[PDB]
Amino acid sequence: KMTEEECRGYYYVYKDGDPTQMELRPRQWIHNDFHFDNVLSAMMSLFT
Amino acid sequence: QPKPIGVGIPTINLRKRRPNVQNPKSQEPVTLDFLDAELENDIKVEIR
Amino acid sequence: RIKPVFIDDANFRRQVSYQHAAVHIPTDIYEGSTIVLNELNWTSALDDVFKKNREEDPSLLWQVFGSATGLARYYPASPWVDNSRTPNKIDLYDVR
Amino acid sequence: VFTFSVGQHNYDRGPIQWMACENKGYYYEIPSIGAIRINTQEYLDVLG
Amino acid sequence: LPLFHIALLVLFMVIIYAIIGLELFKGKMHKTCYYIGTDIVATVENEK
């Protein structure tokens, strides 16, 4: 899913890549921990 | 009969199965040929 | 959503509501995206024909419209045999 | 000729798309086990 | 060249610590809880 409008509902997670062992997990548009939105966050990321 | 028709000897490996992952089920139809629900003659193939 | 009355019946050994038509949407499809909100809006005119078909021949079983977007709509309404996570199993069903 | 490009890689998906486009076919991309159910069932929309 | 004694000291220290660890922890890290009647190591999502 390539947009925040599409990233809703639930999706399947396959354990060990085994297509016969799946679970349900709700998808969510997650913003990365260290980002570059502003010069403060960018300075934090460049510091790390 | 309401059971699904089988194919080959069944073999399942328990040692590689997580407990709660819901390994899926089948969608095959119940396709039981006519000459497999009775005893086959050389006359019944003619009738068929 | 609608809350049904769900009388019990024969010819379906389960609970059935002849007043509207149920809807089943694959688990990994969002119920509220724009592509499915229209298939839910224009198929709302099938319930009249469902009811008329059953009123004519009272011995009809499921009547179903399965659209090309996963959205299935059947009549008479009945709770799906497999909820998403209310049992311990999930529902891998897809009309297509 | 329906052409499926499976997995994630850095190869050239040009000629495969061309084979799909020319022979009244279609080009599908399958990069994960998740996108297998909805990609191996859409060729019917072309046979209709 | 002038780093020769430092190199020898680092080698001797690595050797001493390898022998110490070989004595103390020889064969401890060989158990992990699988699933009961299964050969699938049981970990939470992000655990190793």
DSSP string spanning B6-45?
A: P-S-----GGG--SSS------------GGGSS---SSHH
Reported as type and span, the H/E element at residue D16 is: helix D14-22
Q: Longest C-alpha distance within chain E, in Å?
A: 60
* C31 contacts chain A (CB < 8 A): yes
The strand pairing partners of D5, in sequence order, are D29
User: In one letter, which amino acid is B33?
Assistant: D
Query: Could you tell me the two tokens for E6?
Result: 């430092």
Contact call for residues C60 and C54 (beta carbons, < 8 A): yes
User: In one letter, which amino acid is E35?
Assistant: Y
CB contact under 8 A, C33 and A6: yes
CB contact under 8 A, C85 and A11: no
Method underlying the structure: cryo-EM
Query: Which residues 9-38 of B are in CB contact (within 8 Å) with C?
Result: 20, 22, 24
Contact call for residues C70 and C25 (beta carbons, < 8 A): yes
Measured on CA atoms in the order C52, C56, C62, C67, is the torsion positive or negative?
Answer: negative
Alpha-carbon gap, residue C24 to C95, rounded angstroms = 9
Distance in angstroms between the alpha carbons of the first and the last residue of chain C: 24
User: In one letter, which amino acid is E6?
Assistant: I
CB contact under 8 A, E39 and B15: yes
Determine the distance in angstroms separating the CA of D36 from the nearest CA of chain A, rounded to an integer: 10
DSSP string, C51-79: HHHHHHSTT---EEEE-TTS-EEEESB--
Query: Could you tell me the two tokens for D11?
Result: 């190869």
Alpha-carbon gap, residue C45 to C78, rounded angstroms = 19
Contacts of C94 in chain D (CB under 8 A): 37-38, 41
CB pairs under 8 A between A and B: 12
If you compute the radius of gyration of chain A from its CA atoms, what whole number of angstroms results? 16
Q: Pairing relation of β-strands C63-66 and D2-6?
A: unpaired
DSSP string, D3-14: EEEES---S--H
Alpha-carbon gap, residue D37 to D17, rounded angstroms = 21
Distance in angstroms between the alpha carbons of the first and the last residue of chain E: 43
∠ Cα B31 B35 B37 (to 5°): 65
- CA distance readout (Å), E32 to A15, B15, E24, E29: 18, 16, 19, 8
Alpha-carbon gap, residue B17 to E38, rounded angstroms = 7
Query: Could you tell me the two tokens for B12?
Result: 């399942």
What was the resolution (in A) of this experimentally determined structure? 3.4
Does residue C76 have a cis bond before it (omega within 30 degrees)? yes
Q: Pairing relation of β-strands D2-6 and D26-30?
A: parallel
Nearest to D36 by CA among D1, D3, D2, D6: D6
